[PDB]
Design a protein around this motif. Structure first.
Motif, short mmCIF file in Angstrom:
data_model
loop_
_atom_site.label_atom_id
_atom_site.label_comp_id
_atom_site.label_asym_id
_atom_site.label_seq_id
_atom_site.Cartn_x
_atom_site.Cartn_y
_atom_site.Cartn_z
N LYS A 80 0.84 -1.22 0.00
CA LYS A 80 0.00 0.00 0.00
C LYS A 80 0.87 1.27 0.00
O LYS A 80 0.54 2.26 -0.66
N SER A 81 1.98 1.20 0.73
CA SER A 81 3.02 2.22 0.79
C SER A 81 3.78 2.45 -0.52
O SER A 81 4.44 3.47 -0.67
N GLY A 82 3.74 1.48 -1.43
CA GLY A 82 4.48 1.57 -2.69
C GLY A 82 5.81 0.84 -2.64
O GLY A 82 6.45 0.64 -3.69
N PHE A 83 6.25 0.46 -1.44
CA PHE A 83 7.48 -0.31 -1.26
C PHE A 83 7.14 -1.79 -1.23
O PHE A 83 6.00 -2.17 -0.95
N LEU A 84 8.12 -2.64 -1.47
CA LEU A 84 7.89 -4.08 -1.54
C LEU A 84 7.64 -4.67 -0.14
O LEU A 84 8.36 -4.37 0.80
N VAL A 85 6.63 -5.53 -0.04
CA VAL A 85 6.37 -6.29 1.19
C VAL A 85 6.38 -7.78 0.91
O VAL A 85 6.06 -8.24 -0.21
N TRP A 86 6.75 -8.56 1.91
CA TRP A 86 6.67 -10.01 1.79
C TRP A 86 5.28 -10.47 2.18
O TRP A 86 4.73 -10.03 3.21
N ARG A 87 4.69 -11.33 1.36
CA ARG A 87 3.36 -11.92 1.62
C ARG A 87 3.46 -13.43 1.74
O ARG A 87 4.31 -14.05 1.08
N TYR A 88 2.57 -14.04 2.52
CA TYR A 88 2.58 -15.49 2.79
C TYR A 88 1.17 -16.03 2.68
O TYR A 88 0.26 -15.41 3.18
N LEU A 89 0.99 -17.19 2.07
CA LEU A 89 -0.30 -17.93 2.12
C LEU A 89 -0.10 -19.14 3.02
O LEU A 89 0.85 -19.91 2.77
N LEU A 90 -0.91 -19.26 4.08
CA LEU A 90 -0.87 -20.40 5.03
C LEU A 90 -2.14 -21.17 4.95
O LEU A 90 -3.21 -20.60 4.72
N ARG A 91 -2.01 -22.47 5.11
CA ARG A 91 -3.16 -23.37 5.12
C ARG A 91 -3.13 -24.26 6.36
O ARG A 91 -2.03 -24.67 6.84
N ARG A 92 -4.32 -24.54 6.91
CA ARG A 92 -4.44 -25.35 8.12
C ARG A 92 -4.08 -26.80 7.89
O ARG A 92 -4.39 -27.36 6.84
N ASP A 93 -3.40 -27.41 8.86
CA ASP A 93 -3.01 -28.80 8.72
C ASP A 93 -2.94 -29.35 10.10
O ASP A 93 -1.86 -29.41 10.68
N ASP A 94 -4.11 -29.71 10.64
CA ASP A 94 -4.22 -30.04 12.04
C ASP A 94 -5.24 -31.17 12.25
O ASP A 94 -6.40 -31.05 11.83
N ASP A 95 -4.84 -32.23 12.93
CA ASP A 95 -5.80 -33.27 13.30
C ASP A 95 -6.96 -32.78 14.18
O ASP A 95 -8.01 -33.37 14.17
N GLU A 96 -6.77 -31.71 14.94
CA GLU A 96 -7.89 -31.17 15.76
C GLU A 96 -8.76 -30.30 14.81
O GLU A 96 -8.19 -29.46 14.13
N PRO A 97 -10.10 -30.50 14.77
CA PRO A 97 -10.92 -29.63 13.86
C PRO A 97 -10.90 -28.15 14.25
O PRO A 97 -10.59 -27.83 15.42
N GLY A 98 -11.23 -27.26 13.30
CA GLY A 98 -11.23 -25.82 13.55
C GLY A 98 -12.22 -25.55 14.64
O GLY A 98 -13.25 -26.22 14.72
N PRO A 99 -11.91 -24.59 15.53
CA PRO A 99 -12.81 -24.33 16.65
C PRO A 99 -14.21 -23.76 16.24
O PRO A 99 -15.16 -23.89 17.00
N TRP A 100 -14.33 -23.19 15.04
CA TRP A 100 -15.63 -22.70 14.50
C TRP A 100 -16.50 -23.81 13.88
O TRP A 100 -17.67 -23.56 13.58
N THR A 101 -15.93 -24.99 13.67
CA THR A 101 -16.65 -26.13 13.12
C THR A 101 -17.55 -26.78 14.17
O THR A 101 -17.30 -26.67 15.40
N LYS A 102 -18.62 -27.42 13.71
CA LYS A 102 -19.46 -28.18 14.64
C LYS A 102 -18.61 -29.12 15.53
O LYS A 102 -18.76 -29.13 16.76
N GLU A 103 -17.70 -29.88 14.90
CA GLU A 103 -16.82 -30.82 15.59
C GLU A 103 -15.88 -30.10 16.59
O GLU A 103 -15.64 -30.60 17.70
N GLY A 104 -15.38 -28.93 16.21
CA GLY A 104 -14.54 -28.11 17.11
C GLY A 104 -15.33 -27.55 18.28
O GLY A 104 -14.84 -27.48 19.39
N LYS A 105 -16.58 -27.15 18.03
CA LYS A 105 -17.46 -26.63 19.09
C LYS A 105 -17.83 -27.74 20.08
O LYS A 105 -17.84 -27.53 21.30
N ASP A 106 -18.11 -28.93 19.53
CA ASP A 106 -18.28 -30.14 20.33
C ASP A 106 -17.09 -30.40 21.28
O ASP A 106 -17.31 -30.69 22.44
#
Length: 193
Positions: free
Chosen positions: A149-175
């Motif tokens: 946004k500043s016009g200077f170069l920034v480093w960007r990263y894409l991360l993906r979940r990789d976890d045997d425990e389900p996401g806490p927003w999922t029905k299974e995670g809420k359970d």
């Protein structure tokens, strides 16, 4: 040793996905994200152990099981040094500070413990409505430099979940949150509590 190290990769033993803390000091004390200030805990010659998602950088997106994330530093171009470097090293690809890198076999990369903070709420439906929440292990799929946004170069990263425990927003995670009786942890005396 006797000390439970945060500079160990992976989940902290006894801290399930869905654990919630009102303040950052408590997240630090748990070991899940040690730094008081830094959004990432990592060493430039090793890798990144944890990160906190708390808004900032408008170009970042958070879709729960995946998200984008922007580096720090640079006023000037960002460099693949310090925690930028640490996070890049987690990606299952040889380090490249010119064009960045993408892991075809991204699940083989190093794990990052991810905590979401209330402050990421404007651009994220997954941010907790209060305090801080441990959401599990994620892996760096790819990273790349681009003009910020500043016009200077920034480093960007894409991360993906990789976890045997389900996401806490999922029905299974809420359970699990219900079964384990996870609730917002407030420090002694704050409410008072």
């Amino acid at each position: 040793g006797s000390h439970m190290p945060s500079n160990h990769y992976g989940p902290i033993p006894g801290i399930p996905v869905g654990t919630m803390w009102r303040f950052r000091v408590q997240v630090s004390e748990s070991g899940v994200h040690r730094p008081h200030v830094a959004g990432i805990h990592g060493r430039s010659n090793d890798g990144a152990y944890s990160l906190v998602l708390a808004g900032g950088y408008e170009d970042d997106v958070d879709h729960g099981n995946f998200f984008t994330y922007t580096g720090s530093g640079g006023s000037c171009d960002q460099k693949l040094t310090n925690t930028n470097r640490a996070l890049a090293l987690n990606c299952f690809a040889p380090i490249n500070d010119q064009e960045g890198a993408e892991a075809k076999d991204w699940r083989s990369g190093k794990p990052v413990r991810v905590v979401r903070n209330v402050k990421g709420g404007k651009n994220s439906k997954y941010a907790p409505a209060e305090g801080n929440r441990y959401d599990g292990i994620y892996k760096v799929v790819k990273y790349w430099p681009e003009k910020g946004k500043s016009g200077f170069l920034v480093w960007r990263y894409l991360l993906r979940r990789d976890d045997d425990e389900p996401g806490p927003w999922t029905k299974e995670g809420k359970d699990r949150i219900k079964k384990l009786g996870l609730t917002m942890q407030y420090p002694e005396g704050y409410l008072e509590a």
